[PDB]
């Protein structure tokens, strides 16, 4: 079990860790989160009480280093930092735990939500989407724009998601215009899977990471990536059978976890109706279609 120690909580903030959120009052004696499951990526995110504008947060993997949060009063945010002296770290964490100034990540026999949402997400890939190689964790926020969004303004602060454009030369072979536009299998299987992602797991990893950035930070460009990666699969007549089954499970848990009251802005009516009811894969997403119809029948 791993720990993220907080130097302090000087400003009132809602703190979230993966799908969980909790409130910490101004100068409340809070010194972090304990019992964090090793083996997954995690995200710890923040929304200030005084300015619900700018949700922001850090993706991290406790296997890659000792990480802690300390508020910066000049930059005005909770910053993640790395402590290399492992001794000095254990000491500070142990002191905090003994004084019971940490909240605990919950664990239940019946829960696999977070695993199912991050199954294919790998810190090494996150760090290529979010470029800042001097840290082992990655900062994201509400306002960061994707490379694709930038093309259509600071590149160092961009989300480097794979450009997905259905009306591009990359997507459309000469002489197969109608074929490749109406059945996107070439673009999915040859360009993206064989060419860019190398395997379906890396593809699913980026898809899952875009969803989570959309949900936790309301990152608009992330939502666009999420919908585009779904639509490319759904609009392909030839998809490995294991990928379809895994997509159904992936999307099932995303839909299950979405806040009921955020469905209006994070779900693209056109893409979902197309994917569930018109696309080649309209009959291949049984779990996802059943939860969508029972939870969000309005959108459909």
């Amino acid at each position: 079990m791993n720990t993220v120690p907080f130097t302090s909580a000087p400003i009132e903030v809602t703190i979230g860790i993966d799908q969980y959120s909790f409130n910490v009052k101004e100068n409340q004696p809070f010194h972090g989160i304990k019992d964090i499951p090793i083996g997954h990526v995690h995200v710890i995110h923040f929304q200030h009480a005084d300015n619900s504008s700018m949700r922001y947060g850090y993706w991290f993997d406790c296997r890659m280093g000792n990480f802690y949060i300390q508020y910066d009063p000049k930059d005005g945010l909770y910053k993640m930092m790395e402590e290399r002296d492992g001794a000095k770290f254990e000491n500070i964490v142990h002191n905090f735990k003994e004084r019971q100034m940490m909240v605990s990540y919950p664990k239940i026999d019946e829960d696999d939500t977070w695993y199912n949402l991050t199954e294919f997400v790998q810190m090494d890939k996150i760090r290529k989407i979010v470029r800042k190689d001097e840290n082992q964790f990655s900062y994201v926020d509400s306002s960061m724009t994707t490379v694709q969004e930038n093309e259509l303004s600071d590149p160092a602060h961009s989300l480097n998601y794979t450009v997905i454009n259905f009306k591009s030369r990359e997507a459309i072979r000469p002489g197969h215009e109608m074929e490749d536009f109406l059945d996107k299998s070439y673009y999915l299987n040859t360009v993206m899977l064989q060419g860019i992602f190398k395997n379906s797991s890396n593809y699913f990893g980026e898809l899952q990471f875009a969803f989570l950035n959309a949900m936790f930070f309301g990152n608009y460009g992330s939502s666009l990536q999420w919908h585009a990666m779904i639509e490319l699969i759904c609009s392909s007549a030839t998809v490995p059978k294991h990928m379809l089954d895994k997509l159904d499970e992936i999307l099932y848990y995303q839909i299950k976890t979405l806040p009921e009251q955020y469905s209006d802005i994070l779900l693209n009516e056109r893409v979902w109706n197309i994917c569930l009811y018109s696309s080649f894969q309209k009959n291949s997403l049984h779990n996802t279609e059943k939860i969508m119809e029972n939870k969000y029948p309005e959108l459909l």
């Binding site: 009306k167 030369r169 459309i172 215009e177 109608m178």
Partner: protein
Amino acid sequence: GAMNSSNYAELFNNDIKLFVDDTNVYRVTVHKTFEGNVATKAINGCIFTLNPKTGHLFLKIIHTSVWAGQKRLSQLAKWKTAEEVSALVRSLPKEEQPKQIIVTRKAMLDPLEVHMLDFPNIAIRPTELRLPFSAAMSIDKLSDVVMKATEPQMVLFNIYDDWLDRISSYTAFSRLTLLLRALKTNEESAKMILLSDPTITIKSYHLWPSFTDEQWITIESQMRDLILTEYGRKYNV
């Protein structure tokens, strides 16, 4: 964006553009089979590609052989249209290529955009105008070359005849749209108006009769009346 009543006059500036109409690409007669089912028989079609400034009409004849063994022909027809317009643009020297292509039906936008990815600088635009280019097959000489064709073929016409020697391209287009609107609303009446006077002939290299300026005014008026008339007969007004 979309071509509409507000920006109509851009058609007559000096930027090369083409209208593409696909309404006569895929044409069928519907008939009964011996077993009493219904079946279609395709007949030859055409793509109507028009430069509205110059009158130059690139009439690509769509021979029924292009449909053989194909499925979803109404959808194929839009991609075949786009394939042929793309090929036309590629065949033209750079300084003759259009800067804009305006499709008369929105369903053409994606097929043509996709076929024109190699030309990112050519704007593909829809229009809110309800232009009468479907009636192009009511011009006898155009219908004749389409129906007589035994292979794919491109035929070049000036749909304004020599009118541009006397009137502007705005006025020539207005005349053409009035003529075509009339032929679409009542082809028989319209054709009666155009050819009632045997002394006014169609030159061998023209599509329409050789009216004097004064006779075009009469003709044009008679075409308005027809359209208003049929509007009454149609709506009871």
